[model samples]
Target: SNLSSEEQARLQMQELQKNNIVYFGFDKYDIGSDFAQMLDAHAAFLRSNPSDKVVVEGHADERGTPEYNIALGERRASAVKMYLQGKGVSADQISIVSYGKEKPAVLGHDEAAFAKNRRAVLVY
Candidate 1:
């Protein structure tokens, strides 16, 4: 309990880095119970470190049309933001950007690849 503030932040950042990404189901933006736990920890981190900022980058699979994918991605990011806000994380500490289908984490045309693509990453 006696660590310097900077050192405490460093420690918390390490923990935060471990849980920075959450995946979604096909055409779904729901965080679900499992993802909710991850976001809960994130909310705790942000509430404690108000000075820290996180960018939630929303992404979608290549199945959807580009324009629709963009809208889907936005909704995904908003879901995460709303959850964090409900947990008392400051809206000021979070920003969201939708990448749509522009950036796929995995390059493929299969279900596995699509599953990997549907995600939101918390970037600091």
Candidate 2:
């Protein structure tokens, strides 16, 4: 009983460290269990309410060349879009856009700002 309860708690704990904003580590686009749970939450919302859509808007920090940043941002958004689609969210129901270092969440040239900028937002 205790073991099963602990496992359930662990899964719940992996559900969200960043809620609606899916953050990324430097130059990477990987989804952990936490992100999957977040995506699942969004999927639930979409299933509950049809006639709605979502956009995974990707962003990057101002640390790399514009071209690479744009591509990277796109990959990030595409990852989310694809995952959502795989999770049963229709491709037509999801869109993706890359902001590519053009918008900064914190507007600073620091690691914190960069961390904040690198994200995929589920635009409803």
- Cα deviation in Å at residue 5, candidate 2? 30
For model 1, residues 1-124, the per-residue Cα lDDT tens digits are 5999888878878878887888999998988888788889889888887798999999999987988889989999999999999999888998999989998999989899999899999998
Question: How well does candidate 2 score on lDDT at residue 52?
Answer: 78
Clashing pairs in 1: none
Please give, for residues 1-124, the per-residue lDDT of candidate 2 as tens digits: 4468666645543443236678888888886677787888877666555677877888988988887889889898888877777878787787788889887788877899889898888776
Model 2 — which ten-residue stretch has the worst lDDT?
9-18
Give the number of the best model, judged by TM-score.
1
Candidate 1, backbone clash total: 0
